Amino acid sequence: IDPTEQLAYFPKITFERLTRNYMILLPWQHVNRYNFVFSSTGCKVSLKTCIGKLMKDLNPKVLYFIGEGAGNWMARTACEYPDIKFVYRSLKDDLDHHYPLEYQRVIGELSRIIDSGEGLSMETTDATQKTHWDLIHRVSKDALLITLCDAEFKDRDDFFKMVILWRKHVLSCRICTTYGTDLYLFAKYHAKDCNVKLPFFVRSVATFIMQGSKLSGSECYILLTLGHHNNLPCHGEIQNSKMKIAVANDFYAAKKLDNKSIEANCKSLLSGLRIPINKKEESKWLTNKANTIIDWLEHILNSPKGELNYDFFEALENTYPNMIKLIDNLGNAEIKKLIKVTGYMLVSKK
Amino acid sequence: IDPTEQLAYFPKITFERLTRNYMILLPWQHVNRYNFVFSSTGCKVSLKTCIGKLMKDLNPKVLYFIGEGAGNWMARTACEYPDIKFVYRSLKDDLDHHYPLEYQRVIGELSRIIDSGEGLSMETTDATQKTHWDLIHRVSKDALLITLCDAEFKDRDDFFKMVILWRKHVLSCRICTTYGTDLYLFAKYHAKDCNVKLPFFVRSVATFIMQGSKLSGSECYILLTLGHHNNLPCHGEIQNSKMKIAVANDFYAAKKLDNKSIEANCKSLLSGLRIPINKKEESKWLTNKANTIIDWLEHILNSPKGELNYDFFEALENTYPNMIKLIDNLGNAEIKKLIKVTGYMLVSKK
Ligand SMILES: Nc1ncnc2c1ncn2[C@@H]1O[C@H](CSCC[C@H](N)C(=O)O)[C@@H](O)[C@H]1O
Ligand SMILES: Nc1ncnc2c1ncn2[C@@H]1O[C@H](CSCC[C@H](N)C(=O)O)[C@@H](O)[C@H]1O
Ligand SMILES: [Zn+2]
Ligand SMILES: [Zn+2]
Incomplete structure (x- = not known):
């Protein structure tokens, strides 16, 4: 308290x-906001x-x-x-x-x-x-x-x-x-x-x-x-x-990091679990929206660890096919929620 | 109207x-109630x-x-x-x-x-x-x-x-x-x-x-x-x-059958899609509850068509392992919702 x-x-x-510009589609300014919900x-x-x-x-x-x-x-x-x-x-x-x-x-x-x-x-x-x-x-x-x-x-x-x-x-x-x-x-x-x-x-x-x-x-x-x-x-x-x-x-x-908040935002975008990578250094049952959500987060999981900056963020967008399918199928509130969960994944990597 | x-x-x-009794665990009286939600x-x-x-x-x-x-x-x-x-x-x-x-x-x-x-x-x-x-x-x-x-x-x-x-x-x-x-x-x-x-x-x-x-x-x-x-x-x-x-x-x-109601109950138990069987006669991303829901509905999908009676319902329960894991992990409101969606699947089969 x-x-x-x-x-x-x-x-x-x-x-x-x-003269250098980034050209990104996702609200990446939400990466470090995983601990907040409303x-x-x-x-x-x-x-x-x-x-x-x-x-x-x-x-x-x-x-x-x-x-x-x-x-x-x-x-x-x-x-x-x-x-x-x-x-x-x-x-x-x-x-x-x-x-x-x-x-x-x-x-x-x-x-x-x-x-x-x-x-x-x-x-x-x-x-x-x-x-x-x-x-x-x-x-x-x-x-x-x-x-x-x-x-x-x-x-x-x-x-x-x-x-x-x-x-x-x-x-x-x-x-x-x-x-x-x-x-x-x-x-x-x-x-x-x-x-x-x-x-x-x-x-x-x-x-x-x-x-x-x-x-x-x-x-x-x-x-x-x-x-x-x-x-x-x-x-x-x-x-x-x-x-x-x-x-x-x-x-x-x-x-x-507030686990209660991380879990709140997770449940908020879609009612499904986030996984730690086992690296140690069908999906027909989900709706089109639920699939695009999981498929993006899968790309983030499969992607290596990098510095939390627009250089690395641009790279994550350019290494993902169906980027436009993503921004169209998910509303502004959902993509913002998505990045909060994405940022948590990127912070918790390696 | x-x-x-x-x-x-x-x-x-x-x-x-x-003297004949059935011994079932699910609220099967909800099979024909797929068209209703509240x-x-x-x-x-x-x-x-x-x-x-x-x-x-x-x-x-x-x-x-x-x-x-x-x-x-x-x-x-x-x-x-x-x-x-x-x-x-x-x-x-x-x-x-x-x-x-x-x-x-x-x-x-x-x-x-x-x-x-x-x-x-x-x-x-x-x-x-x-x-x-x-x-x-x-x-x-x-x-x-x-x-x-x-x-x-x-x-x-x-x-x-x-x-x-x-x-x-x-x-x-x-x-x-x-x-x-x-x-x-x-x-x-x-x-x-x-x-x-x-x-x-x-x-x-x-x-x-x-x-x-x-x-x-x-x-x-x-x-x-x-x-x-x-x-x-x-x-x-x-x-x-x-x-x-x-x-x-x-x-x-x-x-x-009211498609708007079927879809309402589907979204209500879990935010994921129902599939028609292609017969023509990982899931790590979902939570424990979401998995038990999909796994039951998968068993219903894989199961053949039968008469909507407690004889066939008992058979569907006895052909499913983790039946007790199911009734424990899903609340009375969720299992009732589950059967509405189950009954729709059984009606829409073959
Ligand atoms: N004309 C107006 N007068 C007062 N509040 C307004 C307004 N137009 C918009 N707003 C408020 O502006 C808010 C923008 S969001 C504010 C977020 C806030 N700084 C926080 O960190 O919690 C909206 O929720 C809305 O309620
Ligand atoms: N003492 C009481 N007096 C009046 N209503 C009561 C009550 N105890 C319970 N109830 C009501 O009984 C309802 C049982 S469910 C009624 C469902 C109804 N036949 C329909 O088909 O829509 C509850 O929703 C609750 O609001
Ligand atoms: Zn004053
Ligand atoms: Zn009177």
Whole structure:
């Protein structure tokens, strides 16, 4: 139940601040996330590593987490800083997690989350709605020193709607205004448009590019404060930083592995067993989906041990026939689950 | 959506009214129930076959169904009599179905169920509680001409608690009393104690022994009316009637087979495909449970075609090694699902 002891199940995070390409089809950023089931985002972004000096400078007693889904990012934060309380908000709908199901799993209980948002309307859970930020202090009367946002907006221009609303709150809140300009919002951002100017009095301190970010996108985490408005990054800038990481850096695997989680993800993709190789250095009964799953994992089993980097991952994709049959027959949720189980196999090899 | 056309998915019911034994381990009474998923009871008992002449004599416009789980018995009744409305009650708890999920499936909608019991307490859903029978006319102001009970009471002596309560209602109900003694309760009964006398003024018209009843039990359906109280059956009497059926009679299979249901039950026991035999007259990747499932179904595939009766079923059990490994490794819900899929395979053979 000790928070600092649970961090051993979390992997070492590599990031970068602000002609060789890989061409892969699988979400390989999920290799070192085998120890997690409902949410996975806690493995790509970490507060102690990315904005650790900022957490020292302004010691927040309460952290405000918006658009947090299953709460894995919040969960790692609970392990990294075992004396910090949390305020949780995530969009209330059928399609996504609106309860910290992963936090509850790795931490044990919701005691440290003083306000989980239990008993709130669809409107008061949406970061793009004024009433959400109005009811943010409904329990915690602590200022929004550091506000974390990981919301995956359907129309990406909703990012701005919540940025303006964050600004509007910190500049019109009895609690927050007593801290001045030294208030930060660490939000996930996709570069839909190049060199876009931030709303009035919103400044980008730093742009963070994650190793655990999907290689094909333009996803980055930007530290926002109150100050003279500047331009946001662009697809190009992020893409070269993302690519530079993939070549040089290798994916770090969690020091300790949670067997209960490994087995959870296994049962989750398909109800069938994983095998250790006997090397010591018909399948007609399964459905088309169940076969493609086992056949990929068989290829991983038969494949030798290699460094956990996009060089070796590209090789595993190029050494497998029916790669396109695979990506078509398995949904985005299944392929992500697949890589968690694949990464475990690759870590447990030799 | 036509009720009479949906009866083709229901199997022909064989029953009996009131030294050779089989020794089987699997619930074979589930062979002809491949077309059903949430509930299965509709295949062992039918009103048009068992008490068809009684439904003619007193034409009920509304039928009262208590302890009905997923509502498959009610569903077959809807097909057998396409102009009858229903009142539904089943115990409200987490462990069992308290909504007619199977009726909704085979019929399409809950339009014919005038009172599904939606918005009732745990107490008003329990047949052993006075308030249940008090709120029975909360919608339907039609007398309890024929009341059907299939409740699977934890302590079997709760059967009497509801029988006395049924009596107490029909003899103290403004609506019901206007019909006199000619009121019937068709209830499931287990012979816990031999020759037990029914409560005062409750008479057993007939005792019904089903082919689709579990061979090892003492389950029977007894038609109860208001009259001089008589004795209930006993384990012995039922057992010889149950055995007499198993020897002579063969299980009738549904004329038409619902592919959507067959596939539902398949996915339900394990997420893997069923194969047609190519005769034209490693498995290390699966878990211990998934293997025992496939290995049994492989034995059924390799086995020749035979009559759907306990003679052939005993033979299939005696021709299979690890029969005890099977019954231990698979729960009562899984083995029941297994036989539904087994029966489909046996029906689809040659
Ligand atoms: N407009 C909006 N306002 C608030 N939350 C939103 C939103 N649009 C999407 N979301 C939330 O954003 C989430 C993206 S996933 C968040 C994962 C999280 N960082 C973790 O590690 O657990 C979704 O689950 C959804 O509930
Ligand atoms: N005391 C009680 N009062 C009412 N219902 C009860 C009960 N004890 C058990 N039950 C119900 O009895 C059901 C037995 S299964 C009923 C299946 C039904 N004939 C069909 O074909 O769909 C359980 O689902 C449970 O909800
Ligand atoms: Zn505030
Ligand atoms: Zn009445």
